[PDB]
Amino acid sequence: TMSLGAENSVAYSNNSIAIPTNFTISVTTEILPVSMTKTSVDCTMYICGDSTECSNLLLQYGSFCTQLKRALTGIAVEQDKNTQEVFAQVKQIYKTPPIKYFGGFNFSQILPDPSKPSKRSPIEDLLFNKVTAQKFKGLTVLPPLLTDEMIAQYTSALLAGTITSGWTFGAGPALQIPFPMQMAYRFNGIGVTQNVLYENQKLIANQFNSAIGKIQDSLSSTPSALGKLQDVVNHNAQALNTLVKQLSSKFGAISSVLNDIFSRLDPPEAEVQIDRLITGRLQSLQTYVTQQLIRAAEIRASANLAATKMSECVLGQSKRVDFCGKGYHLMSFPQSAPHGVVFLHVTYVPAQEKNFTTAPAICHDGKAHFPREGVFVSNGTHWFVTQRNFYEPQIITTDNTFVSGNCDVVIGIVNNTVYDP
Amino acid sequence: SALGKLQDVVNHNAQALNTLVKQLSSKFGAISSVLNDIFSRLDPPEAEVQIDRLITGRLQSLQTYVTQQLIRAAEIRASANLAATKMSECVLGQSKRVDFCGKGYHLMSFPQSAPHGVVFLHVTYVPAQEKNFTTAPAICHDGKAHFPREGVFVSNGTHWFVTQRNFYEPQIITTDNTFVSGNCDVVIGIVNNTVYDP
Amino acid sequence: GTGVLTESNKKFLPFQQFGRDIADTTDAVRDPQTLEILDITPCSFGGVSVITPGTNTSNQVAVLYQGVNCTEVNVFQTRAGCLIGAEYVNNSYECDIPIGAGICASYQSIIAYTMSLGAENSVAYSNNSIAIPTNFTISVTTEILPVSMTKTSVDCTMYICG
Amino acid sequence: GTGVLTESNKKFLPFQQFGRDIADTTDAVRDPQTLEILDITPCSFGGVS
Ligand SMILES: *[C@@H]1O[C@H](CO)[C@@H](O[C@@H]2O[C@H](CO)[C@@H](O)[C@H](O)[C@H]2NC(C)=O)[C@H](O)[C@H]1NC(C)=O
Ligand SMILES: *[C@@H]1O[C@H](CO)[C@@H](O[C@@H]2O[C@H](CO)[C@@H](O)[C@H](O)[C@H]2NC(C)=O)[C@H](O)[C@H]1NC(C)=O
Ligand SMILES: *[C@@H]1O[C@H](CO)[C@@H](O[C@@H]2O[C@H](CO)[C@@H](O)[C@H](O)[C@H]2NC(C)=O)[C@H](O)[C@H]1NC(C)=O
Ligand SMILES: *[C@@H]1O[C@H](CO)[C@@H](O[C@@H]2O[C@H](CO)[C@@H](O)[C@H](O)[C@H]2NC(C)=O)[C@H](O)[C@H]1NC(C)=O
Ligand SMILES: *[C@@H]1O[C@H](CO)[C@@H](O[C@@H]2O[C@H](CO)[C@@H](O)[C@H](O)[C@H]2NC(C)=O)[C@H](O)[C@H]1NC(C)=O
Ligand SMILES: *[C@@H]1O[C@H](CO)[C@@H](O[C@@H]2O[C@H](CO)[C@@H](O)[C@H](O)[C@H]2NC(C)=O)[C@H](O)[C@H]1NC(C)=O
Ligand SMILES: *[C@@H]1O[C@H](CO)[C@@H](O[C@@H]2O[C@H](CO)[C@@H](O)[C@H](O)[C@H]2NC(C)=O)[C@H](O)[C@H]1NC(C)=O
Ligand SMILES: *[C@@H]1O[C@H](CO)[C@@H](O[C@@H]2O[C@H](CO)[C@@H](O)[C@H](O)[C@H]2NC(C)=O)[C@H](O)[C@H]1NC(C)=O
Ligand SMILES: *[C@@H]1O[C@H](CO)[C@@H](O[C@@H]2O[C@H](CO)[C@@H](O)[C@H](O)[C@H]2NC(C)=O)[C@H](O)[C@H]1NC(C)=O
Ligand SMILES: *[C@@H]1O[C@H](CO)[C@@H](O)[C@H](O)[C@H]1NC(C)=O
Ligand SMILES: *[C@@H]1O[C@H](CO)[C@@H](O)[C@H](O)[C@H]1NC(C)=O
Ligand SMILES: *[C@@H]1O[C@H](CO)[C@@H](O)[C@H](O)[C@H]1NC(C)=O
Ligand SMILES: *[C@@H]1O[C@H](CO)[C@@H](O)[C@H](O)[C@H]1NC(C)=O
């Protein structure tokens, strides 16, 4: 019987709180397919081949070939529209500065490598390596409009923009900002003050570098991490293969070769036999097209989700919970992949929590003092006020508290002095 | 070409319906495509199979049309759900999601009706005329490090000011708009300066 | 049959006469006159598409054969196929008519070019410099979204029968 | 065929006899006598709810 999870009862009481005293910078991945392979079929040559009176008989059925070709063309252009929507989000190609010092942060594992002939970042190269015949039946694969070089260039431009200019380049002109200051801004976004970053910058840089290395190793050593893209490839390949094997079926006819039937019988029943064969092949092709349409709709939904993720988690900071990775979102970096995109979500995670005794307000001289932004805590003898997401005890004064009424209405108010500077 | 999507909806429906009506004049391997001529030409024993195959073909065409309509309806329903979310989040309020309600910082949007659709006018705030400055993370003063409360420290070359991030409006650095946290020995990049006490 | 017969490296056993493939089609065969091995490859084929600038501007067109090396068919060889009627240009503009594999075609005669990815830019990043706007611009944009399609109904007897 | 016959302004050429719609069904016809031009319109029909 499968285990639901590890049992964990948390100690809840009406005057106890827990405040983290440390954190951990965590990096996660998220693989999303964007586009599937564009295929085109040759109806006249798949259905019949080299027989011309076969085409003459086919012409009497109607314009099924026209409808099939129109549907396939619509899917093919939809794939390119998906790629444009996801990736072509910046109209200017930014470049990283020649010097690669960003206050200790190490971005070599995601920035393009000039040594590689393809100018791809090491993680992009690993992703390409981790993801992997002749059909004369009339089934052809159209090349994508955007080559992998151009997608890599878009990704590099986005990385340079989000490194040198923060999120400003996603809402107007790019404005340069030193990276530690951008990181402080991003902490200030999630309710942790700037001094927290500035006083332990090197520790955070080391944590970020180690997390990036761990992600690279985890992708290298785990073959099932890129499952979704491989599922896309496998689905298309198996669909084409089933379509190919559908040719070796008699469909109830006495034989399954055009020349054999043309040579063995007279027209009066050869016509009926070929009608049966062509009808069967037409139903097979129609089924293939319908499945292609459904799969294309699903892939389009996934591509729209990926475009939203790129707009929100990359070109800015997202307050939505779990949308851009577990924990408090700091920033994310995109990486390209075959028929997909990979996000590296950098996030803030509290750790090393500590229990405390808390009170809703402080009664002093018949007045009730509430915290402006922090929370009242006490190690057991003295009271302090600290921000919620980090332990930074501060003396309770009249500048970090505000007065609201007397101390006769609040439930749980406690007695203490409030220092006045 | 601004209104391409609605016209595409209209064109898709019209062309699908026209394909359905034109397919009605297809032989489907018959001697004739008019059921009346079939009825005035052959014995019922073979008129039966003639009509059978003709009717089966027409029914298959109608089934294909219905399936295409279902797929298009699902796509349009997805678009309509997106439009409802956009209305609720950009019109009935202000959205902080990037690029959801237009390029730039969103202020407000106004809806407009359209044939088989809706049109949004996203009003947005866009910065311009940027100016470079020299910045520092904190200010050291009497052994104390001062950080901005909501602003950012900038310098035009000789004096230091604190200003809001998205607009240039310099102010004198006082203890009102800055807060102290530790000494000025641990932070990297701190700069000496005075802090006016009101 | 119809195809191109080439010398084959296949080496099937003396009792073995024909050769099939995945799709159950004879792709290898042995000459009755002289016991040698041949491969059957279908003659070169592909789809053809027309690059038109619109009849309201000109009647010139550019023909794009798909997936054929045009030594076997103002001529340009792309990854998608061989393009005839348009000349390659070293410059780069935005994509007007997409061909494929990063090639786009436009009318100015008809020209084919590598699409310009974007206006190149480099921002001056340094570790003690910041840029702050001094002015703003109120911008208004549009967004068109379809909501509902046309409600349709059919009459089974009126359509299937007459 | 079944329908309602109305006077038509369609200008048949002297050799033309019938009239076809998009679906290749007779729409306008010329009566054998009086050599007149007519339209064929199906009788009223619709759904019931
Ligand atoms: C803070 O104190 C509370 C209670 O004083 C701790 O809750 C107990 O933790 C121990 C540790 O294993 C458990 O065995 C007890 O069952 C908990 N109490 C209850 C009522 O469940 C809490 O763990 C302390 N915080 C930290 C971080 O240690
Ligand atoms: C917060 O946690 C970090 C690690 O998560 C602590 O840093 C470690 O400190 C010990 C002792 O100083 C070193 O041996 C380790 O090498 C450090 N880790 C890293 C990754 O550098 C840090 O000390 C914690 N802070 C507090 C206040 O407890
Ligand atoms: C940033 O990270 C890269 C990659 O980890 C570091 O490159 C390493 O450099 C050392 C010595 O220079 C070599 O022994 C390693 O083999 C390099 N790693 C790889 C994967 O080649 C680099 O030193 C780090 N720091 C900077 C400033 O780039
Ligand atoms: C709770 O915190 C206060 C403030 O740090 C502690 O009071 C100080 O404790 C240290 C260490 O014992 C002394 O050196 C200081 O003189 C104390 N300051 C004052 C004003 O008394 C207090 O001890 C802490 N409580 C507990 C139980 O650790
Ligand atoms: C907080 O301070 C107030 C006033 O100093 C305390 O109120 C007194 O409580 C005692 C004990 O019941 C009474 O005898 C006095 O008459 C009260 N005086 C006033 C002005 O209310 C209050 O008890 C203190 N809080 C706690 C928890 O003891
Ligand atoms: C930076 O800004 C300060 C504040 O405006 C400038 O200081 C003033 O400059 C004007 C014109 O030079 C003088 O009239 C004022 O008397 C100055 N005020 C003080 C308190 O000295 C400063 O000149 C600016 N620096 C540069 C390089 O333009
Ligand atoms: C910022 O100010 C502090 C204090 O005024 C300077 O620290 C002094 O530096 C000099 C030369 O480096 C030493 O001789 C003194 O002993 C230092 N005094 C103290 C109290 O630290 C510091 O150098 C200044 N920094 C800058 C960049 O101006
Ligand atoms: C603010 O100053 C910096 C440097 O003082 C400017 O950066 C230079 O801008 C020029 C403009 O053409 C470029 O040619 C240089 O290459 C830039 N320097 C570097 C190192 O790249 C910056 O442009 C100024 N800000 C504004 C708005 O003009
Ligand atoms: C911010 O930009 C606006 C326009 O984008 C500037 O307003 C213009 O000012 C000039 C000079 O006074 C006038 O000739 C124009 O007619 C104004 N434009 C409009 C639309 O009214 C404005 O001056 C800029 N801000 C600053 C501080 O210069
Ligand atoms: C606090 O909790 C204890 C036990 O959980 C309970 O007996 C007491 O009534 C509670 N008091 C308040 C003020 O919540
Ligand atoms: C086939 O017959 C010709 C004469 O007609 C002869 O020259 C040739 O050697 C024969 N081929 C073989 C393989 O025996
Ligand atoms: C800024 O970077 C330069 C090299 O790019 C370095 O010499 C300088 O020390 C850095 N400044 C700070 C404050 O780290
Ligand atoms: C010929 O047709 C016309 C049509 O109105 C009719 O009036 C006339 O009597 C017909 N002639 C004969 C001989 O029936």
mmCIF file with all atom_site columns, N, CA, C and O in Angstrom, chain B residues 140-174:
data_model
loop_
_atom_site.group_PDB
_atom_site.id
_atom_site.type_symbol
_atom_site.label_atom_id
_atom_site.label_alt_id
_atom_site.label_comp_id
_atom_site.label_asym_id
_atom_site.label_entity_id
_atom_site.label_seq_id
_atom_site.pdbx_PDB_ins_code
_atom_site.Cartn_x
_atom_site.Cartn_y
_atom_site.Cartn_z
_atom_site.occupancy
_atom_site.B_iso_or_equiv
_atom_site.pdbx_formal_charge
_atom_site.auth_seq_id
_atom_site.auth_comp_id
_atom_site.auth_asym_id
_atom_site.auth_atom_id
_atom_site.pdbx_PDB_model_num
ATOM 1   N N  . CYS B 1 140 ? 28.408 54.979 4.956   1.00 0.00 ? 140 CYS B N  1
ATOM 2   C CA . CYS B 1 140 ? 29.028 54.820 6.264   1.00 0.00 ? 140 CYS B CA 1
ATOM 3   C C  . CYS B 1 140 ? 29.129 56.185 6.933   1.00 0.00 ? 140 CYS B C  1
ATOM 4   O O  . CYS B 1 140 ? 29.592 57.150 6.319   1.00 0.00 ? 140 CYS B O  1
ATOM 5   N N  . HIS B 1 141 ? 28.690 56.261 8.185   1.00 0.00 ? 141 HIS B N  1
ATOM 6   C CA . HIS B 1 141 ? 28.647 57.524 8.914   1.00 0.00 ? 141 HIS B CA 1
ATOM 7   C C  . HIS B 1 141 ? 28.752 57.233 10.402  1.00 0.00 ? 141 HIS B C  1
ATOM 8   O O  . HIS B 1 141 ? 27.887 56.548 10.956  1.00 0.00 ? 141 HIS B O  1
ATOM 9   N N  . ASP B 1 142 ? 29.802 57.752 11.041  1.00 0.00 ? 142 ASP B N  1
ATOM 10  C CA . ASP B 1 142 ? 30.059 57.525 12.464  1.00 0.00 ? 142 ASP B CA 1
ATOM 11  C C  . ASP B 1 142 ? 30.093 56.041 12.806  1.00 0.00 ? 142 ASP B C  1
ATOM 12  O O  . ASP B 1 142 ? 29.574 55.620 13.841  1.00 0.00 ? 142 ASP B O  1
ATOM 13  N N  . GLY B 1 143 ? 30.699 55.233 11.942  1.00 0.00 ? 143 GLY B N  1
ATOM 14  C CA . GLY B 1 143 ? 30.776 53.812 12.194  1.00 0.00 ? 143 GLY B CA 1
ATOM 15  C C  . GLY B 1 143 ? 29.489 53.055 11.979  1.00 0.00 ? 143 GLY B C  1
ATOM 16  O O  . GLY B 1 143 ? 29.411 51.882 12.358  1.00 0.00 ? 143 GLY B O  1
ATOM 17  N N  . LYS B 1 144 ? 28.477 53.685 11.393  1.00 0.00 ? 144 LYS B N  1
ATOM 18  C CA . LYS B 1 144 ? 27.203 53.041 11.118  1.00 0.00 ? 144 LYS B CA 1
ATOM 19  C C  . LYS B 1 144 ? 26.946 53.028 9.618   1.00 0.00 ? 144 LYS B C  1
ATOM 20  O O  . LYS B 1 144 ? 27.327 53.954 8.900   1.00 0.00 ? 144 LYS B O  1
ATOM 21  N N  . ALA B 1 145 ? 26.299 51.967 9.153   1.00 0.00 ? 145 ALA B N  1
ATOM 22  C CA . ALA B 1 145 ? 25.965 51.808 7.744   1.00 0.00 ? 145 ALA B CA 1
ATOM 23  C C  . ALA B 1 145 ? 24.487 52.117 7.551   1.00 0.00 ? 145 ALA B C  1
ATOM 24  O O  . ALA B 1 145 ? 23.633 51.495 8.189   1.00 0.00 ? 145 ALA B O  1
ATOM 25  N N  . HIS B 1 146 ? 24.190 53.064 6.669   1.00 0.00 ? 146 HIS B N  1
ATOM 26  C CA . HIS B 1 146 ? 22.825 53.490 6.400   1.00 0.00 ? 146 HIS B CA 1
ATOM 27  C C  . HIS B 1 146 ? 22.371 52.925 5.064   1.00 0.00 ? 146 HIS B C  1
ATOM 28  O O  . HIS B 1 146 ? 23.066 53.076 4.056   1.00 0.00 ? 146 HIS B O  1
ATOM 29  N N  . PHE B 1 147 ? 21.209 52.282 5.059   1.00 0.00 ? 147 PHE B N  1
ATOM 30  C CA . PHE B 1 147 ? 20.615 51.745 3.851   1.00 0.00 ? 147 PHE B CA 1
ATOM 31  C C  . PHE B 1 147 ? 19.372 52.545 3.483   1.00 0.00 ? 147 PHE B C  1
ATOM 32  O O  . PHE B 1 147 ? 18.717 53.106 4.363   1.00 0.00 ? 147 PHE B O  1
ATOM 33  N N  . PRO B 1 148 ? 19.024 52.625 2.203   1.00 0.00 ? 148 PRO B N  1
ATOM 34  C CA . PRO B 1 148 ? 17.801 53.335 1.824   1.00 0.00 ? 148 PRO B CA 1
ATOM 35  C C  . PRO B 1 148 ? 16.569 52.617 2.340   1.00 0.00 ? 148 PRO B C  1
ATOM 36  O O  . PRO B 1 148 ? 16.542 51.390 2.461   1.00 0.00 ? 148 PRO B O  1
ATOM 37  N N  . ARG B 1 149 ? 15.532 53.396 2.645   1.00 0.00 ? 149 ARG B N  1
ATOM 38  C CA . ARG B 1 149 ? 14.281 52.798 3.096   1.00 0.00 ? 149 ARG B CA 1
ATOM 39  C C  . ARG B 1 149 ? 13.504 52.213 1.923   1.00 0.00 ? 149 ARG B C  1
ATOM 40  O O  . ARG B 1 149 ? 13.235 51.008 1.883   1.00 0.00 ? 149 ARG B O  1
ATOM 41  N N  . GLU B 1 150 ? 13.133 53.051 0.951   1.00 0.00 ? 150 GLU B N  1
ATOM 42  C CA . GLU B 1 150 ? 12.566 52.555 -0.294  1.00 0.00 ? 150 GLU B CA 1
ATOM 43  C C  . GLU B 1 150 ? 13.316 53.011 -1.534  1.00 0.00 ? 150 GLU B C  1
ATOM 44  O O  . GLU B 1 150 ? 13.024 52.510 -2.623  1.00 0.00 ? 150 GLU B O  1
ATOM 45  N N  . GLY B 1 151 ? 14.258 53.930 -1.412  1.00 0.00 ? 151 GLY B N  1
ATOM 46  C CA . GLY B 1 151 ? 14.910 54.527 -2.558  1.00 0.00 ? 151 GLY B CA 1
ATOM 47  C C  . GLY B 1 151 ? 16.208 53.859 -2.948  1.00 0.00 ? 151 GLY B C  1
ATOM 48  O O  . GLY B 1 151 ? 16.455 52.688 -2.644  1.00 0.00 ? 151 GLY B O  1
ATOM 49  N N  . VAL B 1 152 ? 17.049 54.622 -3.644  1.00 0.00 ? 152 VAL B N  1
ATOM 50  C CA . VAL B 1 152 ? 18.349 54.150 -4.099  1.00 0.00 ? 152 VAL B CA 1
ATOM 51  C C  . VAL B 1 152 ? 19.316 55.320 -4.022  1.00 0.00 ? 152 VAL B C  1
ATOM 52  O O  . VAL B 1 152 ? 18.952 56.460 -4.314  1.00 0.00 ? 152 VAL B O  1
ATOM 53  N N  . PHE B 1 153 ? 20.546 55.040 -3.606  1.00 0.00 ? 153 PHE B N  1
ATOM 54  C CA . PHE B 1 153 ? 21.553 56.083 -3.487  1.00 0.00 ? 153 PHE B CA 1
ATOM 55  C C  . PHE B 1 153 ? 22.173 56.366 -4.847  1.00 0.00 ? 153 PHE B C  1
ATOM 56  O O  . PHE B 1 153 ? 22.641 55.450 -5.526  1.00 0.00 ? 153 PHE B O  1
ATOM 57  N N  . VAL B 1 154 ? 22.175 57.635 -5.244  1.00 0.00 ? 154 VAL B N  1
ATOM 58  C CA . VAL B 1 154 ? 22.772 58.051 -6.503  1.00 0.00 ? 154 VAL B CA 1
ATOM 59  C C  . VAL B 1 154 ? 23.652 59.260 -6.245  1.00 0.00 ? 154 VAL B C  1
ATOM 60  O O  . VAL B 1 154 ? 23.530 59.943 -5.227  1.00 0.00 ? 154 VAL B O  1
ATOM 61  N N  . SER B 1 155 ? 24.548 59.521 -7.189  1.00 0.00 ? 155 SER B N  1
ATOM 62  C CA . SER B 1 155 ? 25.454 60.650 -7.092  1.00 0.00 ? 155 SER B CA 1
ATOM 63  C C  . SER B 1 155 ? 25.667 61.231 -8.476  1.00 0.00 ? 155 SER B C  1
ATOM 64  O O  . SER B 1 155 ? 25.895 60.491 -9.434  1.00 0.00 ? 155 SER B O  1
ATOM 65  N N  . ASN B 1 156 ? 25.593 62.555 -8.577  1.00 0.00 ? 156 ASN B N  1
ATOM 66  C CA . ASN B 1 156 ? 25.833 63.217 -9.850  1.00 0.00 ? 156 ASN B CA 1
ATOM 67  C C  . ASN B 1 156 ? 27.302 63.538 -10.077 1.00 0.00 ? 156 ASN B C  1
ATOM 68  O O  . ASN B 1 156 ? 27.641 64.109 -11.118 1.00 0.00 ? 156 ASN B O  1
ATOM 69  N N  . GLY B 1 157 ? 28.172 63.189 -9.138  1.00 0.00 ? 157 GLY B N  1
ATOM 70  C CA . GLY B 1 157 ? 29.592 63.424 -9.296  1.00 0.00 ? 157 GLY B CA 1
ATOM 71  C C  . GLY B 1 157 ? 30.244 63.975 -8.047  1.00 0.00 ? 157 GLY B C  1
ATOM 72  O O  . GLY B 1 157 ? 31.399 63.657 -7.754  1.00 0.00 ? 157 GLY B O  1
ATOM 73  N N  . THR B 1 158 ? 29.521 64.792 -7.302  1.00 0.00 ? 158 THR B N  1
ATOM 74  C CA . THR B 1 158 ? 30.064 65.365 -6.076  1.00 0.00 ? 158 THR B CA 1
ATOM 75  C C  . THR B 1 158 ? 29.194 65.096 -4.860  1.00 0.00 ? 158 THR B C  1
ATOM 76  O O  . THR B 1 158 ? 29.724 64.779 -3.793  1.00 0.00 ? 158 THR B O  1
ATOM 77  N N  . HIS B 1 159 ? 27.877 65.199 -4.995  1.00 0.00 ? 159 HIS B N  1
ATOM 78  C CA . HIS B 1 159 ? 26.964 65.017 -3.881  1.00 0.00 ? 159 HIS B CA 1
ATOM 79  C C  . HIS B 1 159 ? 26.180 63.729 -4.065  1.00 0.00 ? 159 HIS B C  1
ATOM 80  O O  . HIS B 1 159 ? 26.054 63.204 -5.172  1.00 0.00 ? 159 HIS B O  1
ATOM 81  N N  . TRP B 1 160 ? 25.659 63.223 -2.955  1.00 0.00 ? 160 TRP B N  1
ATOM 82  C CA . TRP B 1 160 ? 24.882 61.996 -2.933  1.00 0.00 ? 160 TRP B CA 1
ATOM 83  C C  . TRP B 1 160 ? 23.439 62.307 -2.572  1.00 0.00 ? 160 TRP B C  1
ATOM 84  O O  . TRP B 1 160 ? 23.171 63.170 -1.733  1.00 0.00 ? 160 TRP B O  1
ATOM 85  N N  . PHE B 1 161 ? 22.514 61.605 -3.217  1.00 0.00 ? 161 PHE B N  1
ATOM 86  C CA . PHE B 1 161 ? 21.096 61.744 -2.938  1.00 0.00 ? 161 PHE B CA 1
ATOM 87  C C  . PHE B 1 161 ? 20.478 60.361 -2.864  1.00 0.00 ? 161 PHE B C  1
ATOM 88  O O  . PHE B 1 161 ? 21.084 59.364 -3.259  1.00 0.00 ? 161 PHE B O  1
ATOM 89  N N  . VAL B 1 162 ? 19.257 60.308 -2.350  1.00 0.00 ? 162 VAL B N  1
ATOM 90  C CA . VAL B 1 162 ? 18.440 59.104 -2.374  1.00 0.00 ? 162 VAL B CA 1
ATOM 91  C C  . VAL B 1 162 ? 17.188 59.418 -3.176  1.00 0.00 ? 162 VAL B C  1
ATOM 92  O O  . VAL B 1 162 ? 16.587 60.484 -3.007  1.00 0.00 ? 162 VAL B O  1
ATOM 93  N N  . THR B 1 163 ? 16.830 58.523 -4.091  1.00 0.00 ? 163 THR B N  1
ATOM 94  C CA . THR B 1 163 ? 15.716 58.761 -4.992  1.00 0.00 ? 163 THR B CA 1
ATOM 95  C C  . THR B 1 163 ? 14.949 57.468 -5.212  1.00 0.00 ? 163 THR B C  1
ATOM 96  O O  . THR B 1 163 ? 15.475 56.372 -5.019  1.00 0.00 ? 163 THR B O  1
ATOM 97  N N  . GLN B 1 164 ? 13.691 57.611 -5.616  1.00 0.00 ? 164 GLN B N  1
ATOM 98  C CA . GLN B 1 164 ? 12.879 56.450 -5.936  1.00 0.00 ? 164 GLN B CA 1
ATOM 99  C C  . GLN B 1 164 ? 13.417 55.764 -7.187  1.00 0.00 ? 164 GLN B C  1
ATOM 100 O O  . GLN B 1 164 ? 14.081 56.377 -8.024  1.00 0.00 ? 164 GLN B O  1
ATOM 101 N N  . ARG B 1 165 ? 13.116 54.471 -7.311  1.00 0.00 ? 165 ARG B N  1
ATOM 102 C CA . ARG B 1 165 ? 13.753 53.658 -8.342  1.00 0.00 ? 165 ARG B CA 1
ATOM 103 C C  . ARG B 1 165 ? 13.283 54.046 -9.738  1.00 0.00 ? 165 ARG B C  1
ATOM 104 O O  . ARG B 1 165 ? 14.097 54.201 -10.652 1.00 0.00 ? 165 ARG B O  1
ATOM 105 N N  . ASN B 1 166 ? 11.977 54.228 -9.920  1.00 0.00 ? 166 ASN B N  1
ATOM 106 C CA . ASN B 1 166 ? 11.400 54.375 -11.250 1.00 0.00 ? 166 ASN B CA 1
ATOM 107 C C  . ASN B 1 166 ? 11.322 55.816 -11.732 1.00 0.00 ? 166 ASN B C  1
ATOM 108 O O  . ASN B 1 166 ? 10.854 56.053 -12.848 1.00 0.00 ? 166 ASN B O  1
ATOM 109 N N  . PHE B 1 167 ? 11.774 56.777 -10.938 1.00 0.00 ? 167 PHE B N  1
ATOM 110 C CA . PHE B 1 167 ? 11.723 58.171 -11.347 1.00 0.00 ? 167 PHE B CA 1
ATOM 111 C C  . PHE B 1 167 ? 12.863 58.906 -10.671 1.00 0.00 ? 167 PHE B C  1
ATOM 112 O O  . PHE B 1 167 ? 13.260 58.550 -9.562  1.00 0.00 ? 167 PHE B O  1
ATOM 113 N N  . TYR B 1 168 ? 13.388 59.922 -11.339 1.00 0.00 ? 168 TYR B N  1
ATOM 114 C CA . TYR B 1 168 ? 14.482 60.703 -10.781 1.00 0.00 ? 168 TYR B CA 1
ATOM 115 C C  . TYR B 1 168 ? 13.907 61.872 -9.998  1.00 0.00 ? 168 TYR B C  1
ATOM 116 O O  . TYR B 1 168 ? 13.318 62.786 -10.582 1.00 0.00 ? 168 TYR B O  1
ATOM 117 N N  . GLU B 1 169 ? 14.074 61.839 -8.685  1.00 0.00 ? 169 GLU B N  1
ATOM 118 C CA . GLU B 1 169 ? 13.641 62.918 -7.811  1.00 0.00 ? 169 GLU B CA 1
ATOM 119 C C  . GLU B 1 169 ? 14.557 62.952 -6.597  1.00 0.00 ? 169 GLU B C  1
ATOM 120 O O  . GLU B 1 169 ? 14.218 62.394 -5.547  1.00 0.00 ? 169 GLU B O  1
ATOM 121 N N  . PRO B 1 170 ? 15.719 63.585 -6.705  1.00 0.00 ? 170 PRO B N  1
ATOM 122 C CA . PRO B 1 170 ? 16.716 63.489 -5.637  1.00 0.00 ? 170 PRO B CA 1
ATOM 123 C C  . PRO B 1 170 ? 16.260 64.168 -4.359  1.00 0.00 ? 170 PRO B C  1
ATOM 124 O O  . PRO B 1 170 ? 15.544 65.171 -4.378  1.00 0.00 ? 170 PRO B O  1
ATOM 125 N N  . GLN B 1 171 ? 16.693 63.604 -3.236  1.00 0.00 ? 171 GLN B N  1
ATOM 126 C CA . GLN B 1 171 ? 16.418 64.158 -1.922  1.00 0.00 ? 171 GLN B CA 1
ATOM 127 C C  . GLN B 1 171 ? 17.690 64.099 -1.094  1.00 0.00 ? 171 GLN B C  1
ATOM 128 O O  . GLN B 1 171 ? 18.566 63.265 -1.327  1.00 0.00 ? 171 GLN B O  1
ATOM 129 N N  . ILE B 1 172 ? 17.785 64.991 -0.122  1.00 0.00 ? 172 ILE B N  1
ATOM 130 C CA . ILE B 1 172 ? 18.907 64.978 0.806   1.00 0.00 ? 172 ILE B CA 1
ATOM 131 C C  . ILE B 1 172 ? 18.830 63.720 1.654   1.00 0.00 ? 172 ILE B C  1
ATOM 132 O O  . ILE B 1 172 ? 17.752 63.323 2.108   1.00 0.00 ? 172 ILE B O  1
ATOM 133 N N  . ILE B 1 173 ? 19.974 63.075 1.857   1.00 0.00 ? 173 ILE B N  1
ATOM 134 C CA . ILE B 1 173 ? 20.032 61.851 2.647   1.00 0.00 ? 173 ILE B CA 1
ATOM 135 C C  . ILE B 1 173 ? 19.952 62.232 4.119   1.00 0.00 ? 173 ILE B C  1
ATOM 136 O O  . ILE B 1 173 ? 20.864 62.866 4.654   1.00 0.00 ? 173 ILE B O  1
ATOM 137 N N  . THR B 1 174 ? 18.865 61.854 4.775   1.00 0.00 ? 174 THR B N  1
ATOM 138 C CA . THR B 1 174 ? 18.684 62.074 6.201   1.00 0.00 ? 174 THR B CA 1
ATOM 139 C C  . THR B 1 174 ? 18.515 60.733 6.900   1.00 0.00 ? 174 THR B C  1
ATOM 140 O O  . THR B 1 174 ? 18.557 59.672 6.277   1.00 0.00 ? 174 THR B O  1
#
